[PDB]
Design an enzyme around this catalytic site. Structure first.
Site, PDB file in Angstrom:
ATOM      1  N   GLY A 176     -61.852  -7.682 -72.933  1.00 52.55           N
ATOM      2  CA  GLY A 176     -61.015  -8.042 -71.812  1.00 52.55           C
ATOM      3  C   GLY A 176     -59.620  -8.498 -72.171  1.00 52.55           C
ATOM      4  O   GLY A 176     -58.837  -8.814 -71.265  1.00 52.55           O
ATOM      5  N   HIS A 228     -17.445 -14.757 -45.370  1.00 58.62           N
ATOM      6  CA  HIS A 228     -17.529 -14.235 -44.017  1.00 58.62           C
ATOM      7  C   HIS A 228     -17.917 -15.351 -43.051  1.00 58.62           C
ATOM      8  O   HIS A 228     -18.139 -16.501 -43.439  1.00 58.62           O
ATOM      9  CB  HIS A 228     -18.538 -13.088 -43.940  1.00 58.62           C
ATOM     10  CG  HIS A 228     -18.402 -12.080 -45.037  1.00 58.62           C
ATOM     11  ND1 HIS A 228     -17.381 -11.157 -45.081  1.00 58.62           N
ATOM     12  CD2 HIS A 228     -19.170 -11.842 -46.128  1.00 58.62           C
ATOM     13  CE1 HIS A 228     -17.521 -10.397 -46.152  1.00 58.62           C
ATOM     14  NE2 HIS A 228     -18.598 -10.793 -46.806  1.00 58.62           N
TER      15      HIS A 228
END
Ligand SMILES: CCCCCCCC/C=C\CCCCCCCC(=O)O[C@H](COC(=O)CCCCCCCCCCCCCCC)COP(=O)(O)OCCN
Ligand SMILES: CCCCCCCC/C=C\CCCCCCCC(=O)O[C@H](COC(=O)CCCCCCCCCCCCCCC)COP(=O)(O)OCCN
Ligand SMILES: CCCCCCCC/C=C\CCCCCCCC(=O)O[C@H](COC(=O)CCCCCCCCCCCCCCC)COP(=O)(O)OCCN
Lengths: 700, 69, 57, 570, 50, 101, 101
Positions: free
Chosen positions: A501, A77
Site C-alpha cells: 500500500g 475599480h
C-alpha cells in the site's frame, strides 16, 4: 490586488450564481498581475453572465441597470450601486475599502473614465442532462446567421444567372440568325458579358465569405472540444487507448462540414431543382418527362455505388496507415534490425503489406471508374432520347431550334443536385455514426468542483488520520488504519514489500484517490474542502516513468509558466544535477528533446523531470520510485544532490530498495496496509527479528 | 533540352536489349500460387478485356471502311 | 497574396477574440449588396439604352 | 543510380499493354470527333429537309458509338491502373530491400524523420502515377486532330482558341507556386497540431498531476488559429485560381459566339457547323484545364525523385565472402586488439588478449572510459579493429559472413527497442514459423511468463509504440526472452541488468543460473554485484586487462582495483 | 438543493467559511464531511435523502 | 484453416520448372514427399523425404518413377481482417458473387 | 406543400422541445415553492424566489414567442404557394376560355 476577482464574485453574489474564485484564478489568471479586461469578460461569460463594455456618459448612467462595474484602466475599480438625482449623489461600492460609500458629482466625474461594464443574468435549462446530439453544435452555428443568409442570397442570384443564360442563347439562335439583326446581337453580347462577370465575382465572394464563417466556427468548436477533453478525469483515460481518443477528437471536422456545407447546399438544391423542373415543363413536357424518368436511375445508381466504394476507401486508408506505421517503426529501429539479421523477415512483411495495399487501391479505382461510367452512360442515353424527340418536335412544331438548345442546356445543368441528395441520404447516417462515436468523449461528466474553502499557501505539514482505502468496493482493503503525521522540513522514507500500500500514498496526498474511511489533511485542513488545482500545483511529484513534452528543455522545465525568468531554470537544473549535460549540449537549454527518445538518455530525462518538478518552490516533494529504474550514474548524482534538494522542503521518499532511505529522518515500514515499524535507520536495524532488518538482509 | 536526348539514348540502348529482361510466360495457376508481391508483379492483365477492346476498335474500323466505299 | 500567415491573421482567428464578439459580421459587410445593386443598375441602364430592331414578315 | 531513368526498362518491359493504351486513347479521340459530326449533320440535313430516315440511322449510329466509347474508356482506365499498380509494387519492393541493406553509419548520421519522409516520397510517387496525371497528357498529345478539324471549319474562330491556350498556361504558371507554398504551410501546421494533440493525450496523467491545463489550452488555441488561418489562405488562393480559368473560358466563349454569329449571318459557316465547332472547342479546352495539376506535378516529382535517389545513391555493403563456416561453439578469442573510433581519435582498447571457453560465465567490469562497452560491438561486425583479429572457433571474423555471425550471437542491450506487434511476434521475430512451445520455454527461462499470464491478451498483447503497455523491466525481460528464443552458444549482457527496477532485476539474476546452462555468457556491467557468480571476473582500465580471477581470489587482495571498485560501489 | 445551498438558503451568496462555522456550531460538520459529495450532497425532495 | 492457399493441379514434368516451390506431391498411397529446388542444368530434384525426415537429392529417373502427374501448390494468403457481420439478407450477396456464372 | 411542411417541421419540433423544458422547469419551481411556502415566509426569501420566477418566466415567454413566429412564417409560406397556384390557374384558365375548349 485582485479587484477583478472581488468585483466578479460580488457581481455573482448579486445575481445569485455559483462562483469559484480559485478556479477563476487558475483558468483566467494564469500568470498573474490581476485578470484584465478580456479575461474578466471571459470569466464572467464562463459564470453564465451577460457582460459587455459600453461607452456611456455621466448623464446616461440614469437609464442603465445597476449594479455596474466601472473598469478603470490603471487598476483599482469600483462598482456603481445606485445613482441618485434627488440629491445628485452616486452611491458606489468601493473595492479597496471593502464597503459601500457615497460620492458626489465632482468626485464621480473625476473617477469616471467614460467606460462602464453592463451585467445581466438569464435562465438556462441545458445543464448536463442533454444527451450528445447535433444540439452540441447549433449554438455555435446559429451565431453566423447573417453570413449564412448572405451566402444563401448569393447562391440564389447565381442560380438565376445560370437559368438566365440559356434564354440569351435562345434569343440569339431564334432572332439574330433568321433576321439579320446586328443590333440585338450587340445588346445580347453585352448582357451575357455582364452576367458572366458578375456570376464569377459573386461565386468568388460567396466562397470567400462562407470559408471565413466556417473557419471561425471550426476554431470555436475545436477550442471548446479541447477544453472539454482536458477537463475529463484520469479514470476516463485509464481505460481508453490513445489512438482511439485522438481519432474521436479528429472526427469533429466531418460533423462540422456536414452541418455547414451540406445542409445549406441541399436546401438550395431542392428548391432550385423545383424551379428548373417548372421551367423545363413550360418548354416541353415530353422531354421533361424523359428527364424525370431518368431521375430514379441516377438516384438508384448513386445509392447502390456509394456504400461499396466507401468500404473500399476505408480498407485502403487502413492499409495505408498500417504500412506507414510499419515503415516508420522499421526505419527508427534499424539498429536492432542490423544487430540481428532479421532483414529477410522484415522484407517479407513489407512485401505482403505493400501487395495488399496496392491491390486495395486497384480495387478502389476500378469501382470508382465503374460508377463514373455508369453515370455517364445514363446521361448519354438520356441525351440520345432527347435528341431524337427534339428533332421530331422541331420538324413538326411546338418547339423551335433555340428552344431545344436552351432545354438541352437546362437538362445538362440539372443533373448534379439529385445525385447530391441521393448521397446526403446516406451521408446523414455516416454523420450519425460519427456523432455517436464523438459522444464517447463529449457526453462524459466533466469532473468539476463546486465548493472549496480557498485555503492559504501550503507549508509542509501532512497528517493522515484513520485512512482506509480500497481500489474497488469489492476489492480487499489496501490500507487498514493508517495513521501518520509529518512535520515541516522532515525527510521521511517509506519502505515495504509488494502490495504493502505504499504506492497509494502519492495519489492520496494529491486528490486522485478518495479514502474509504478517514481523511487526509494538510496544515489541519481537510483536503475534501480544498481545490485540487490549488493543491496539485503546490506538490512536486516525481515518478519512475515521467513524460516530457516535445517543445524544448527550456519549455519543458518552464511548463508551469513560460513567461517566467530564465535564471530560475538554471537554478533548478543545478539543484537536480541536470545542468551539466544541458550545458554540454549544442543549443544548451534550447535543445529540442526529440519526438520520443532522441538524444537524451533515460537518466537524463529523469533529471529533466526532477528539475521541472523543482523549478517552483514546492514545500512537499514526493519521490515515488524516482530512483528505481535509473542507471548508476544518474542514481549516483541524484543521491549526491539529494542533501541539497531536500532543503526547506517536506520530502517523502517512497522506494522498494532500502538503501535509498538510509539518510531519511524517519523510515516508515508498512505491511499489508499497517505501519508495523518506524524510527531511524540504525535503531530499526538494531532489532534482529524486525521486518526492517529482515528485508535489509533479504535484499543484501 | 539535354534531358530528352539522354532519355532517347538510354531508351534506344535498352531497346537493343529487348526481350533479354522480359518475364517468363506462365499459366494462370502458376501465377496465382506465387509470393504476394511476385504474383501481382508477374501477372498479365487478362485476355478478355483486351479482346473486347480489339473487337470494338475493329468494328469501328470496318464500319468506317464500309461507309467510305 | 504570397505572404505567409502573419500575426494579424492568427489574432483574427483566436478563440478568445471570437468568443467575446457576439453576433459577428463578415470581414467586409457591404460587398454583396454593393455588387447586387451594381448589377441591377447596370441591367437597368442596358435595358433603357439597348435597342432592338423590328422585322415585319 | 536512381533518376528519372529505371522506368524506361519498366516501360519497355510493359510494351504491348502501353501501346494498347495509346491506341485505345487514339480511338477514344476518334469517337469524341465522331459525335459532334453527327450533331452537325443532323442539324444541317434533318431540320432543313425532312429526313426522318437520316435521323433514324444517325440515332442508332450515335447510340452504338457512345456505348462503345464508354466501354473503351473503362477498359483503358482498367489497363492503365493495372500497369501502374505493377510498377508501384516493383518500386516499393526494390526501395525497401535497398533501404534495409544500408550501413548503420548512414542512419546514425541522419535523422529518422528526414529518412522516413524521403521514403514516404514513394507514396506520393504512387499517387502521381495512379491518378489522372498520366491519362491527360495523352489527350493533350492527341488534341491536334480536333485542332485540325476546327481549323478546317473556320480559320478565324480557332485562332481565338489557339491564342487562348497561352493565357491558360501563363495564368496557371502564375497561380501554381503560391498555392503550392500555402498548401505546404497548411500541411506542416496540421502535422504540428496532430503531434501536439497526440502527445497531450499520451501525457494526460502528467498534465493533471501538475496544474498546466490552462497552458495547454493557450498553446492549442494558438496552434488552431494558425492552422485555420493557413487553411483560409489556401481556400482563397484555390477559389481565385478556379475563377480566373472560368473567366478566361467564358470570355473566349463570348468572343467565339459573336464572331460565329457574324460568320453565320454572312456565310462560310452553317449553324450545325458552329455547334460542332463549339463542342470541339470545349473538348479541346477541358484537358488543358485539367493539365494545371500536371504542370504542378511534373515539377514536384522532380525534387521528389531527386531525394528518393539521394536515398538510393548509397553503397549497400553487400558481402561476397563466406567460407561456409559451420555452426559456432561458444569460445571467443581476442588477439592484440587495438581499436579507435576514428583515425584521429585516441585509442580506447590497447592490447587486450582474451580467451573464453565453452560454458564459461565470464564477467567484465570497470569504470567509465575503461573501453568495456566496445567489446560487444567488436564481437559483432560493427567495429573494425586497427590491429589484431577477433576470431570465433579459430575462424577470423574479418573473413566471415557478418549476417550469419549475428544470427549465431544473441545480445541484450540496455535499450532493447521492441516492434509494435504482439509479444509472441516480438519474441519470434527471427523465425515467425517457430512452434509456440519454444517461445513458452524462452519466456520461462527469461522469467517473463509470470507477468504475461496476468496481461489482458496473454502472448497476443500488443506491446504498443515501441513498448507502452509494459514497464521497463517487463520489456527488458521480453528482450531477454527474444535473445534466448533460439539456442545461441554466445550470449552477451551489455549492461542489461543495470537500468531496471527491483522485482525485475531480482527475477533475472535468480534465473541467471539456468539461463547460462550450455552457453558462453559475457556479462558486462558497471555494478560489481551482478558479476559475483561469474567464473572469471575481469577488471580492465584504459583498455588494459589489469587482473582476472574469481570473486574471492580478486577481493582477498586489498591492492587490487577490484577491491577499490567494490568499496566505491558499497 | 445541495447541503450548502440549503444551509445558505436565507442568503445563497455566502462563502464556505460561514457554512463551516455554522455546521461546526450545530454539530453537523462531521456527518456532512463523511459524505462523498460533502457539502454538495443533494438532499432530494423535502430533504428525503437525510 | 491455417490461412494458406492450396490447390491440386495437373503438372507435367516439363512444366514442373515454372511452379513456385516448395510443393507437395500427393500419392494415392500415403507416401507423399515435398518437392523443393528443382535444379536445371543437372536434372536433379531436392525432395524432402517425409519418411526419412531429412532432405535427399534425387536425379531425373527416380523422380520420374516417383511422380505420377499431380502436385499440390502452396501459397501463403493470410487475410488481415477482424470483424463479424450481422446476419441479414445481405449474406446472400457474396453467395451470388461466388455463383455468378 | 409537402416539401415546405417537411422543411419546417423539425425546427418547430426543436423549438417546442425547448418550450416544454422551460414549462417543466417552471412547473417544478412552482410546485416546490407552493409546497414549502411556510419555509419561504419564515426565512423571508421572497426576493430570491421572485428573481428566479422572473428569469424562468422570461425564458418561457421567449421560447413561446419563437414558436409562434416560426408557425406564422410556415403558415405564410403555405399561403404563398396557394396564391401563386391561384394566379397561374387564373392566367391559364383565361387563355383556355378565350380559345374555346
Ligand atoms: C405525373 C403524371 C402527369 C402526366 C403528364 C402528361 C404530359 C403529357 O401528356 O404531354 C404529352 C406527352 O404525352 C406523354 O408522353 C404522357 C406520358 C405519361 C407517363 C405531350 O404534350 P406536348 O405539350 O405536346 O409536348
Ligand atoms: C423511350 C421513348 C418513349 C417515347 O418516345 O414516347 C413519347 C413520350 O415520351 C415519354 O414521355 C416517356 C419517356 C421515356 C422514359 C425513358 C427514360 C430514359 C432513362 C433510361 C435510363 C438508361 C439506363 C411519345 O412520343 P412518340 O409517340 O414516341 O413519338 C412519335 C413522333 N410522332
Ligand atoms: C407566376 C407565373 C405566371 C406566369 C404564367 C406561367 C405559364 C405556365 O405556367 O405554363 C403552363 C405550365 O407551366 C408549369 O408547369 C408551371 C407549374 C408550376 C407548378 C408549381 C407552382 C407553385 C410554386 C409556388 C412556389 C413559390 C416559391 C402551361 O404553359 P402553356 O400555356 O401550355 O405553353
Amino acid at each position: 490586488i485582485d479587484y477583478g476577482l472581488y468585483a466578479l464574485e460580488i457581481l455573482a453574489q448579486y445575481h445569485n450564481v455559483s462562483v469559484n474564485p480559485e478556479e477563476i484564478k487558475h483558468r483566467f489568471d494564469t500568470d498573474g498581475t490581476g485578470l484584465g479586461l478580456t479575461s474578466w469578460l471571459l470569466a464572467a461569460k464562463s459564470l453564465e453572465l451577460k457582460v459587455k463594455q459600453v461607452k456611456k456618459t455621466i448623464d446616461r448612467l440614469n437609464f442603465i441597470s445597476l449594479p455596474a462595474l466601472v473598469w478603470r484602466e490603471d487598476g483599482r475599480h469600483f462598482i456603481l450601486t445606485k445613482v441618485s438625482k434627488e440629491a445628485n449623489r452616486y452611491l458606489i461600492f468601493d473595492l479597496e475599502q471593502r464597503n459601500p460609500r457615497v460620492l458626489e458629482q465632482s468626485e464621480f466625474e473625476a473617477l469616471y473614465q467614460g467606460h462602464i461594464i453592463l451585467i445581466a443574468s438569464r435562465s438556462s435549462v441545458t445543464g448536463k442532462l442533454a444527451k450528445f446530439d447535433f444540439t452540441w453544435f447549433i449554438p455555435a452555428i446559429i451565431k453566423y446567421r447573417k453570413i449564412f443568409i448572405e451566402t444563401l442570397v448569393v447562391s440564389v442570384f447565381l442560380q438565376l444567372f445560370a437559368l438566365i443564360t440559356p434564354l440569351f442563347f435562345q434569343v440569339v439562335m431564334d432572332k439574330v440568325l433568321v433576321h439579320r439583326g446586328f443590333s440585338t446581337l450587340n445588346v445580347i453580347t453585352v448582357a451575357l458579358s455582364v452576367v458572366v462577370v458578375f456570376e464569377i465575382i459573386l461565386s468568388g465572394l460567396r466562397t470567400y465569405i462562407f470559408a471565413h464563417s466556417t473557419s471561425r466556427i471550426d476554431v470555436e468548436l475545436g477550442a471548446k472540444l479541447f477544453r472539454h477533453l482536458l477537463a475529463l478525469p484520469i479514470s476516463y483515460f485509464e481505460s481508453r487507448r490513445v489512438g482511439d481518443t485522438v481519432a474521436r477528437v479528429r472526427e469533429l471536422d466531418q460533423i462540422r462540414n456536414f452541418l455547414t456545407g451540406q445542409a445549406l447546399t441541399s436546401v438550395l438544391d431542392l428548391l432550385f431543382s423545383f424551379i428548373f423542373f417548372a421551367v423545363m415543363w413550360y418548354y416541353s413536357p415530353k422531354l421533361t418527362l424523359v428527364i424525370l424518368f431518368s431521375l430514379p436511375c441516377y438516384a438508384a445508381w448513386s445509392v447502390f455505388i456509394s456504400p461499396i466504394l466507401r468500404r473500399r476507401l476505408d480498407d485502403k486508408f487502413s492499409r495505408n496507415a498500417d504500412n506507414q506505421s510499419f515503415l516508420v517503426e522499421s526505419v527508427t529501429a534499424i539498429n536492432t534490425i542490423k544487430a540481428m539479421a532479421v532483414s529477410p523477415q522484415m522484407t517479407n512483411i513489407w512485401d505482403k503489406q505493400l501487395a495488399g495495399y496496392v491491390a486495395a487501391g486497384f480495387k478502389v479505382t476500378v469501382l470508382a471508374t465503374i460508377g463514373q461510367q455508369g453515370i455517364q452512360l445514363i446521361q448519354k442515353t438520356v441525351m440520345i432520347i432527347n435528341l431524337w424527340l427534339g428533332a421530331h418536335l422541331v420538324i413538326s412544331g411546338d418547339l423551335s431550334i433555340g428552344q431545344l438548345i436552351a432545354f438541352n442546356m437546362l437538362a445538362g445543368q440539372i443533373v448534379a443536385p439529385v445525385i447530391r441528395l441521393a448521397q446526403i441520404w446516406q451521408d446523414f447516417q455516416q454523420v450519425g455514426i460519427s456523432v455517436t462515436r464523438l459522444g464517447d468523449v463529449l457526453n462524459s461528466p466533466t469532473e468539476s468542483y463546486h465548493g472549496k474553502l480557498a485555503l492559504p499557501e501550503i507549508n509542509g505539514n501532512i497528517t493522515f488520520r484513520n485512512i482506509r482505502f480500497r481500489y474497488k468496493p469489492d476489492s480487499p482493503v489496501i490500507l487498514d488504519n493508517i495513521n501518520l503525521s509529518i512535520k515541516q522540513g522532515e525527510v521521511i522514507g517509506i519502505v515495504g514489500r509488494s502490495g504493502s500500500g505504499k504506492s497509494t500514498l502519492t495519489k492520496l496526498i494529491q486528490r486522485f484517490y478518495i479514502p474509504e474511511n478517514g481523511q487526509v489533511l494538510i496544515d489541519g485542513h481537510d483536503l475534501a474542502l480544498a481545490d485540487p488545482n490549488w493543491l496539485r500545483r503546490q506538490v512536486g511529484v516525481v515518478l519512475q516513468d515521467n513524460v516530457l513534452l516535445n517543445r524544448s528543455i527550456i519549455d519543458n522545465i518552464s511548463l508551469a509558466n513560460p513567461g517566467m525568468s530564465v535564471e530560475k531554470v538554471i537554478y533548478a537544473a543545478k539543484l537536480a544535477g541536470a545542468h551539466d549535460f544541458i550545458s554540454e549540449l549544442r543549443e544548451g537549454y534550447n535543445t529540442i528533446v526529440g519526438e520520443q527518445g532522441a538524444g537524451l538518455s533515460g537518466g537524463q530525462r529523469q533529471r529533466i523531470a526532477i528539475a521541472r518538478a523543482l523549478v517552483n518552490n514546492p514545500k512537499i516533494l514526493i519521490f515515488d520510485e524516482a530512483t528505481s529504474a535509473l542507471d548508476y550514474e544518474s542514481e549516483h548524482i541524484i543521491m549526491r544532490n539529494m542533501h541539497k534538494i531536500c532543503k526547506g522542503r517536506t520530502v517523502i521518499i517512497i522506494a522498494h530498495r532500502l538503501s535509498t532511505v538510509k539518510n531519511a529522518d524517519r523510515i516508515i515500514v508498512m505491511e499489508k496496509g499497517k505501519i508495523v515499524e518506524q524510527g531511524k535507520h540504525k535503531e530499526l536495524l538494531s532489532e534482529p527479528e524486525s521486518l526492517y532488518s529482515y528485508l535489509y538482509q533479504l535484499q543484501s | 533540352s539535354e534531358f530528352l536526348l539522354r532519355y532517347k539514348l538510354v531508351w534506344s540502348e535498352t531497346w537493343k536489349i529487348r526481350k533479354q529482361l522480359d518475364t517468363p510466360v506462365r499459366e494462370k495457376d502458376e501465377n496465382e500460387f506465387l509470393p504476394a508481391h511476385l504474383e501481382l508483379i508477374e501477372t498479365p492483365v487478362s485476355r478478355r478485356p483486351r479482346l473486347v477492346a480489339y473487337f470494338i476498335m475493329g468494328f469501328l474500323v470496318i464500319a468506317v471502311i464500309l461507309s467510305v466505299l | 497574396l504570397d505572404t505567409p500567415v502573419r500575426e494579424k491573421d492568427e489574432n483574427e482567428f483566436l478563440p478568445a477574440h471570437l468568443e467575446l464578439i457576439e453576433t459577428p459580421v463578415s470581414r467586409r459587410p457591404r460587398l454583396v449588396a454593393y455588387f447586387i445593386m451594381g448589377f441591377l443598375v447596370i441591367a437597368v441602364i442596358l435595358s433603357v439604352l439597348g435597342q432592338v430592331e423590328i422585322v415585319a414578315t
